[PDB]
C-alpha cells in the first residue's frame, strides 16, 4: 500500500516521522525503491524544498512528494491528513511553484524522456552513475552504457550527459563528438528537466564539441 522515505531531515526529524510511522503502521525505509509511494521532504512554509537525489527520484517515479509538515500537522491533529494538501510545490533552484511533482504524477503515460537514448558519461560527483541512469529510465529514456552503443537512425535521439566540474585537466568533454554523433549536455539538463517534469530544450546546456 504505502511506503515512505524522507529527505532533508535531521536525524531527529526522522525520529518524529519514525514515531508517526510506528503509530500508524506505515512502512518507512531509508532507501528509495520502486515500491516507495511517498518521499517526505523538509520544506519551508510554502512547501519549497531542496533538490536532493530522493527528490529527483521521487518525481521521476511519479510518487507523492510531500512536505514534512504533512507529518507534523497530522500528529498535531491526531488524524491522518491527506497528502494532496501538503504536496511540494517547487524547489530552491527551479521555481517556488513549478508544480513539478504534480506534473510527474499526472504524466506517467507521457514521460519527459520518452523516445530518447541517454548515455550518462562519467565521471560524476554526489550522485552515483547508476542512480542518474535509473532517474532517466524512470523518465522514459533508454539507457546506453557506451558511446559506440547508441542506436543509429533518423528516428533516434541520442544524448550524452556529462558533468564538466567532475573532470579536471580533462578538457576531454569537448572531444566526445569525435567519438559519436550526439548533442552533449550537462547533467543540469537532466536535473532541471526532472524537477520541472518538463523536458528542457538542449540549448542552454549544450557543450561545444571540437570538430
Amino acid at each position: 500500500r504505502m511506503s515512505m522515505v524522507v529527505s532533508g531531515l535531521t536525524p531527529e526529524e526522522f525520529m518524529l516521522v519514525y514515531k508517526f510511522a510506528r503509530k500508524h503502521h506505515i512502512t518507512l525505509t531509508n532507501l528509495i525503491t520502486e515500491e516507495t509511494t511517498h518521499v517526505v521532504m523538509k520544506t519551508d512554509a510554502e512547501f519549497v524544498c531542496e533538490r536532493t537525489l530522493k527528490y529527483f527520484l521521487g518525481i521521476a517515479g511519479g510518487k507523492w512528494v510531500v512536505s514534512y509538515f504533512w507529518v507534523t500537522q497530522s500528529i498535531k491533529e491526531r488524524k491522518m491528513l491527506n497528502e494532496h494538501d501538503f504536496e511540494v510545490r517547487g524547489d530552491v533552484v527551479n521555481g517556488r511553484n513549478h508544480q513539478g511533482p504534480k506534473r510527474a504524477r499526472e504524466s506517467q503515460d507521457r514521460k519527459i524522456f520518452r523516445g530518447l537514448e541517454i548515455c550518462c558519461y562519467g565521471p560524476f560527483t554526489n550522485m552515483p552513475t547508476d542512480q542518474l541512469e535509473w532517474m532517466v529510465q524512470l523518465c522514459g529514456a533508454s539507457v546506453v552504457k557506451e558511446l559506440s552503443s547508441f542506436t543509429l537512425g533518423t528516428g533516434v535521439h541520442p544524448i550524452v550527459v556529462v558533468q564538466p566540474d567532475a573532470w579536471t585537466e580533462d578538457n576531454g568533454f569537448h572531444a566526445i563528438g569525435q567519438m559519436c554523433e550526439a548533442p552533449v549536455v550537462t547533467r543540469e539538463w537532466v536535473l532541471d528537466s526532472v524537477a520541472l517534469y518538463q523536458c528542457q530544450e538542449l540549448d542552454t546546456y549544450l557543450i561545444p564539441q571540437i570538430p
Binding site: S7, G8, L9, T10, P11, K42, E50, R51, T52, L53, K54, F56, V92, V93, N126, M127, E188, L191
Partner: peptide
C-alpha cells in the same frame, strides 16, 4: 541531513 543537495 548528510544528503547532498544539487544547486547551480
Amino acid at each position: 541531513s548528510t544528503s547532498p543537495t544539487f544547486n547551480k
